[PDB]
Every structure is written in structure tokens, then in C-alpha cells.
């Protein structure tokens, strides 16, 4: 924050690339801000890039090892294929503790994610009949 993270968030959301990168490896050495602040509405810069589906920023952020959190879940909800395409290979949240990637993936019929996660291999739990 401190009118230091505000520029970072604005650059990320507006679509800039060079400025965002420069901010990354500047704050990486001056230890001035945290890369993973959530100012406005609990929105990590990663989430901001996710919801604008801007692939370049997301793939750049994966380089700097910024904390991921349950961003995979947000991408799944948003139905963006490239985001989960990248994320797949390598406190209190707003998602119920029950939900796993496959459950939410099935909650929205979108062939691609179901096929991908089946390729990786999962196993949805089964209930006990009554």
C-alpha cells in the first residue's frame, strides 16, 4: 500500500507489461512492498490478471513465485483454459472447505477442464447410500 502498491495494482490491471516487470524486480531487491497485497476487495494481483485473462502477466508472475493460493479455483469458476493450463503443471478463503478442483470443475459443464483433470487423474468421492 502506502501509495506504492497502488501503482503496481493499477499497472497490472491496465494491461501494462514493462512497468509491472520493473516493479517486480525492484521490490524484489528493496524489500519495500509485498508482491501479494490485496488492497481493494481482497484481490491479489494474480487474481486481477486472472479475471482479465491476460496470459502474459500471469506467466510472468509464475516466474517470481508469488503465492498462488486457491487461484486455480477462481480460474475454474471463470472458465479460462490457459490459466488452468499453466497452473496445473509445476488464510480464510471464499470457497467452502469441501470443494476440490474436480467438484467445481464438474459444477460447470465445460468439456476442456474435465478432460484435462481426468488426464492428470483424480477420483471424486462417493456418498454412502441411505
Amino acid at each position: 500500500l502506502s501509495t506504492q502498491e497502488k501503482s503496481y495494482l493499477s499497472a497490472v490491471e491496465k494491461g501494462d507489461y514493462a512497468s509491472v516487470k520493473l516493479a517486480l524486480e525492484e521490490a524484489e531487491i528493496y524489500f519495500k512492498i509485498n508482491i501479494n497485497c490485496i488492497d481493494p476487495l481482497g484481490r491479489t494481483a494474480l487474481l486481477i490478471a486472472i479475471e482479465n485473462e491476460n496470459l502474459e502477466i500471469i506467466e510472468l508472475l509464475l516466474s517470481f513465485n508469488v503465492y498462488v493460493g486457491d487461484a486455480l479455483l477462481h480460474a475454474i469458476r471463470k472458465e479460462v483454459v490457459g490459466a488452468v493450463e499453466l497452473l496445473l503443471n509445476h488464510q480464510f478463503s471464499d470457497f467452502t472447505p469441501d470443494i476440490t478442483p474436480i467438484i467445481l470443475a464438474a459444477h460447470t459443464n465445460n468439456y476442456e477442464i474435465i478432460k484435462m483433470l481426468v488426464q492428470k487423474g483424480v477420483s471424486v468421492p462417493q456418498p454412502h447410500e441411505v
Binding site: 491496465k14 494491461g15 479475471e51 482479465n52
Partner: peptide, 22 residues
């Protein structure tokens, strides 16, 4: 969402062109 994505893509193309102009 479509509004956001269109406007953001245009803005990114603007920034790239301006950066590579000079």
C-alpha cells in the same frame, strides 16, 4: 466480462505500441 476484456486488450496493445515507438 466481455467489456472488461475488450477494453483491457485494447489498452495493452496501446501500451506495447507506445513502448516500442521509442
Amino acid at each position: 466480462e466481455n467489456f472488461k476484456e475488450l477494453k483491457q486488450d485494447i489498452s495493452s496493445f496501446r501500451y506495447e505500441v507506445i513502448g516500442m515507438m521509442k
